[PDB]
Design a binder for this molecule. Structure first.
Ligand code: CA
Ligand code: CA
Ligand code: CA
Ligand code: CA
Ligand code: CA
Ligand code: CA
Ligand code: CA
Ligand code: CA
Ligand code: CA
Ligand code: CA
Ligand code: CA
Ligand code: CA
Lengths: 171, 167, 169, 169, 172, 170, 170, 172, 169, 171, 167, 169
């Protein structure tokens, strides 16, 4: 966790982003759909100045690719963003995520000066829900039949935290 | 008495005139604009993009009544976010429910969407009641989601499924 | 004054902007590029049409007379700040409009754009103007020494600011 | 300490620039456009190579160790002014290089570039830095209230300046 | 004299510029490219519209008659210097407007552009013009031998200059 | 001096040009555009590759040490004139090369390029250099008052010239 | 002849150029590229707008009738020479304009553009035109054998020249 | 003599071309643009690669030593004429290879390009070269007065030509 | 019949060209690319305007009636040859223009363009046309078997030629 | 029918093509999907040199827009194409179609020298089927549940004619 | 023992090598190619186009076994044309049926297609019997559809529905 | 001969094509553009890579020696015709390969590309070659008079053709 680092995504990381798709569902890049890696590469150069989405690669002390932190739908009048996080499967079950959630929130709130961060979790992933609740996220919606995961439509939490809570919880 | 038509370049004026009678930032494919020239340039930029669709609401005499928008259209999960704008002069005439109906009809028989949701300010409880009466149900109470008119404001997220509407 | 409005700037407004910048007799700037001719202005307008670093609004009255311009420049969306300027057309000065325009700029800045801090520069040798901005809620945070070359000599300007917390609640 | 030289920044130095922003934990900007990734930086570098609004110099010693960076930005060539900042790589700090680099910045600014004024921003909460810039001839012309969002809160900065007249007599 | 204004040059004024060349019968230049046809002048104007090394102004009277042209060229913002040239249209020559235009150029150069030095060239075989410039505060700094090929032969020109400190603080 | 050769400047020589520009430690220009970054110089070079208003020669000895640079600028092919400058690397200043190079430059300007006149600028505060130029045939035609901001002050420069006819009918 | 004015060729004049080219009914060229279509001429014109190797003047009277065309081509600014041609519209041939225009052309070449030499070509089978040129100061320097395929056969042309010095020291 | 071949010029031969200029000390041209540096030569080569108004050939021996250069320029396919120029590298001068190269140029010009007339210029103060060309079948058609500025003065050149019918059917 | 002139084809003449292909009921081609629509033709025209492989001339009378078209294609400038064809608008046929236009084609080909050979293709089943080209000096050099697919079947064409030597003595 | 004419489609016709979509289903342009007219205009310039599809506008004596003839999937090694035809609804029921079928076949077989033309007709449009059978088209497939017309999946005939049949039927 | 992988630029060689061991014209997004350079250029041209998709068939050791192609993919009607190519060295080993299965599986559970059809030359009755045995049924006998090896040849069109396969 | 193959032409084959066109000593053409240098060839290759008007095949033997080239040019896909040429490398001539290459070209033309008619040009002054093509099924349809300038004089060529109906059934 002291071992872990965040780093802005670069071209050389696209291979890894594409492997993490393999683990599942579709992937998107600035909300443009892609399947193949050559597609992804083309989409990457196209949106390199686009500020609506930010990605960081997570590595350990020996430069292992651990996972991915994403902020999307960044809107700077509303000062909000959606947060996703993806851990390589050979690196889940080792605690790393809470640390990463903090790093991401810290960045959103101490550097981007965003006001709000929200996310979606599967209702039927009650561990993940509760994990976000522990980091300070509150439920604000139970989205009915939202996403088509594993052969049926499923409900998802949408959960949020605000900047004042993250930054002044301890005052 | 009321039609929907695919929007085209000639309608941009109308759209720009609606954005002004509302006095908040407007978006085109999630990009903000203020001037007509800004809109024109974004219209051209997003001509081939499916993430949003818009229909001009006219009457049998070609008066411009309002606008129907599907944004965040998701073709895998078969959902979209719906908005309506009615021109100031046609507000409070009884067109809103008819347009809601036409739009769900199109969305659920022609676009074959599974879900349609929307956002309504918490501070507009009458819009909220109207959408409840059209069959929408609350699925979220988004806290301080949107900075509107000088402070952050809550919105209800309201939805309807295809299975409900097609009964 | 109630019937004064702000409208986002359009290509057809550029003649007016050029004419305003003409009895001002200092160099004027579009997105930090100096210009003098309408033709260069028009070209800068087309080139920076999607740049969010500056925003401009034409002030009109009830029968659409062109009263003036509001500019926000140096907009930074992390610090949530912007510099601002007002230019009233010379034939509409001294009719009391200024205070209302200042209000409407602040109103846009703080109620639509969600900025935190607006600041401006006023010539030290225009104490009446300074006193005007003080009345609308601005406070001096800087007295910039020989900042601008104006009329053949370097001049001091007061830098004056107001926060969103103050204008709103 | 004459051991230390400036040289104009060029493409091989963008790794260093990137590595320096990594430590600092704020948004960094190339010609007012924000960037995070090396790739964003590289593309920005190529785009603005003909742009004279900002100028940068890498700092090296005898053995060409990469000590730090001098940045002039907001260069205006009618008013003859520029904002400056100075970044020393963490591992070369508190060796008393700052003063020397400040002098080189000023010397370039005033005997090569022919500017009239240089200004900078120093955190109010860093009175040591404020005091260093004072020993080097800078004088405080403002106290900018809640100017920057840094480390989770809005912060005041001193604005400090020196004129070409003072530096050269 | 009194009611003569400087306006930045526009695309519609290129015809005027062109007629002024035509009437004058030496090779002309735009951003150091020689041109003869209007169409080349137009293309050059478009190409160099953001180039700040040259600036041109059109002179008008109250009735909007086109009177003359002021150019600054070779403008350098480190040495803060420029070459200045002025042309009055044939039919407006000999009404003594030149002093008024020279003052406008100097004032723009020194109050709006904040330059340090403005210089110009005058043909040695035009001693009136030399004396005219001397009255307006220019001083000789060179006599440039066979500098220009003009009307079948190389001619000498005076080079003449004035400093911002002099234009601006003479009277202080 | 026998052994001093001129050749046309090339992309490989820009690093040399850049390093010379640094030692002089005044702002330098390519086709009247100022540069400081090697990368900007390089992009100025490509962009102006077909521009004939300036022409530049690297000076080499028999062992291909880089001695200096000869430039003509402001070349005008109607009036047939050009401005000439010469920079010798610091480590070869004072060895006697300068007259030889001036001569090579005059030679090229007047027997190849067919110019009529070549003028240069010399700091008024370097009178030994002014005399050097007089000894090679140049004449003072101007004393340009506060023409260049160089090392923190505006400086006067002699303008000095020679004509084709004089160089050829020697 | 008082009343004959030169002005620089413009886009509006190309229709005139095209119609002249037709009457002569030989293949004609723009910057050494052959054209026949007005549209190709027009696209050759835009493309070569900044090319100084050819320069062209329309000739007008006091009433702005189009009299003819003066061209210089093959302009070389090192050697200071150019090839000169002149076409008079058929309906103004034989009125006495030609000497006046040759003179205007020599005047421009030698007192404005500072060329050293101007040469032209005349069909060997038009000896009255060859004499006309001799009367204006031109001298034969070549008799070019089967140089041009014109009207179904290779034809000989005189090459004729005048120098700046002779035109000026008249 | 016998084992000398013509090969179309390639990008790798530009260095050779360039060294040949360097050694020769007059201004050189590529598609009528003057160049001095290799880098400009390279850019011009790229720009004009489909231009058929000029064609160049490199001369090699059996060991692939670079011997010389043949250019045809001003090629016109209606008059069917071209200007021809030949350059032998300093170190291969005086081995009498010139006749062999001139024959190759004439043969290409007249058998592969099907031109009608090839002409060239020779300095009047090089009467050997004139006589050399005359032996190879060229005839004088002009003595061009002060045509070229070369080594500090204008020089006269012979212009010299040969026709396809003569090269090809002399012997018939 | 000297009344008739050639002039080089240009953009205003593309309606006429298009209207002429409409009658003929075969594929028509611009520089070997097939086209059907005016828009395809226009775009093709612009693309190939600098291409010297084909040349076209519109034919007009005294009153500038649009009589027809002369087309040289496959122009090769080493071998000095070209394929030619001639199209007279339906309403101007059988007035004895063909011969005159054939002569103009040849005259251009051989006294302006300096070609060595001209050839054309005539349908075997049009022995009248074959005979016209014979009266004008053409001689048959081939009988191309099933060369073209026209009106639903493969057809033989005569290939007919004349040389510059013959035309000019 | 003597009154009718075929004419290669041009830019000015795109308005009409777009109105004929109104009558229904999706439309495509060189097998790129389009909805809006501004989309169609952009797609039109893009494929203007593309030879795989040919369209003709049908007009009457007074320039009325009657309908549309399309050849798509034109392949010139196999020498085949798919044929569609669309009549404006205010102009159906007037016989015009058989004439148009002939004009299209004539063009395919006398000018393009194609070998085969095929088409699809709804199985549940037995009149249209029989209409094509009368023009010389033979069934070669009954495509099961092929296209989703009016709320269920429907069967379609694929029918063909060859060049030798069209051209030599009478020999 | 056998995988499917999305095709990428590195696979072009393999594809080009398969096209050669077949000796008929090959197509990429309906455009013909012969050379590798031609293919490369078409690959780049169609990177963003959904009308076709291809999967490289590898084994657990990374040997290249063959290719699975969906072309004429129709996202409205939810159909596609399917082809398989097996590298010459792996023909007649019993991989074909497994690959058919994998491809229908992907098409009908992951791509959620309604229909998959194919073409098989009439003169290859054993391929026809093989596809019948995998569940495909004839829906057409396309007459002289394809010019292959010097004459026009008939093909069967054979199909399977999602409803059949998912029992 | 059985072990001779055709392979579609690749960029790396261009050296071979250039070398073949070199001991031929007549002007050679890529898509009707003349060329002489490899560099121009390479550039023409890139430019016409998607043009279907010409197709080329390299002939190799069992151990991939480069034997020769087959070209189809002037391909028209409505008339279904093409012109063809064969060039065997000088070190592989007179080894009996020609007849097989001719067969394989025809085979491609008629069994893969579905052309109707292939034709070629053969110098009248190469009667052995004419006799060769006659043996593979070609028939004279034209004797083209002074078609090509070759070796300093105009030359006759036989045009010789074969139909798909003849090669196949
Ligand atoms: Ca979105
Ligand atoms: Ca400017
Ligand atoms: Ca700024
Ligand atoms: Ca020019
Ligand atoms: Ca610069
Ligand atoms: Ca200059
Ligand atoms: Ca042409
Ligand atoms: Ca020339
Ligand atoms: Ca050059
Ligand atoms: Ca298809
Ligand atoms: Ca070529
Ligand atoms: Ca051809």
């Amino acid at each position: 966790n002291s071992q872990l680092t965040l780093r802005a995504l670069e071209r050389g990381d696209l291979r890894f982003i594409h492997n993490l798709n393999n683990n599942r569902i579709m992937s998107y890049w600035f909300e443009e759909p892609y399947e193949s890696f050559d597609e992804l590469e083309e989409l990457y150069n196209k949106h390199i100045h686009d500020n609506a989405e930010r990605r960081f690669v997570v590595e350990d002390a020996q430069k292992n690719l651990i996972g991915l932190v994403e902020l999307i739908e960044i809107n700077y009048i509303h000062r909000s963003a959606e947060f996703q996080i993806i851990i390589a499967p050979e690196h889940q079950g080792k605690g790393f995520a809470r640390t990463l959630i903090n790093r991401a929130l810290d960045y959103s709130f101490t550097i981007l000066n965003l006001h709000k961060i929200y996310l979606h979790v599967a209702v039927e992933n009650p561990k993940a829900v509760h994990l976000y609740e522990e980091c300070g996220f509150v439920e604000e919606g139970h989205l009915v039949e939202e996403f088509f995961i594993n052969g049926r439509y499923q409900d998802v939490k949408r959960m949020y935290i605000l900047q004042s809570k993250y930054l002044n919880r301890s005052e």
